[PDB]
Ligand binder design. Sequence first.
Ligand SMILES: *[C@@H](CC(C)=O)[C@H](C[C@@H]1CCNC1=O)NC(=O)[C@H](CC(C)C)NC(=O)[C@H](CNC(=O)C(C)(C)C)NC(=O)OCc1ccccc1
Length: 180
Amino acid sequence: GPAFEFAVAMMKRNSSTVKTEYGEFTMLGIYDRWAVLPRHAKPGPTILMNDQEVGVLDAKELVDKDGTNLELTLLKLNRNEKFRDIRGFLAKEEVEVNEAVLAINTSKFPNMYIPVGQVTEYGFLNLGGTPTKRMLMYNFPTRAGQCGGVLMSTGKVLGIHVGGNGHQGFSAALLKHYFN
Ligand SMILES: *[C@@H](CC(C)=O)[C@H](C[C@@H]1CCNC1=O)NC(=O)[C@H](CC(C)C)NC(=O)[C@H](CNC(=O)C(C)(C)C)NC(=O)OCc1ccccc1
């Protein structure tokens, strides 16, 4: 319940629906004009944010010290409004919680929430055939179209949904130091 209430308020304030040439995704704005998308959203020079064209000034595909994929892309938007700073909700390291909610906000899944329960630091995962690190895992039957969904618990934004299959889902940990 507390996770859900936190999630609903967070999505209302910081999330948006974005369309790239590769699909429609839930997007979370972090601070200033910087947001995050799963790496496979592959944002080009402009994106559609809440149905309006927005230019992308910069986009960084995140990888660790050894070049291993982290499945997240950070983008700086060409817009005047600034995102409410939610960096204080981002942990310094991978979070594990007993009750988390996954929040999705797109045309296909309009403001929908999923109780995914326990989140464990899974870590290494060959994801879609690509070695990936800092994965968080939860047991729930996720679906295509849910990528970009925001994984949260009471007072915490843990990561962004990037994959899954069968009845497991995985998020890339959204760490504080990715934004300084
Ligand atoms: C969101 C992105 C889109 C286009 O909607 C999906 C979410 C997942 C679909 C299945 N359930 C979901 O929650 N993400 C993908 O489809 C994801 C894409 C990558 C990183 C670009 N690929 C996976 O989610 C996932 C990767 N592999 C594994 O999880 C295992 C267990 C096999 C290691 N699996 C998947 O998409 O199906 C298998 C697969 C398809 C194609 C290539 C490789 C594996």
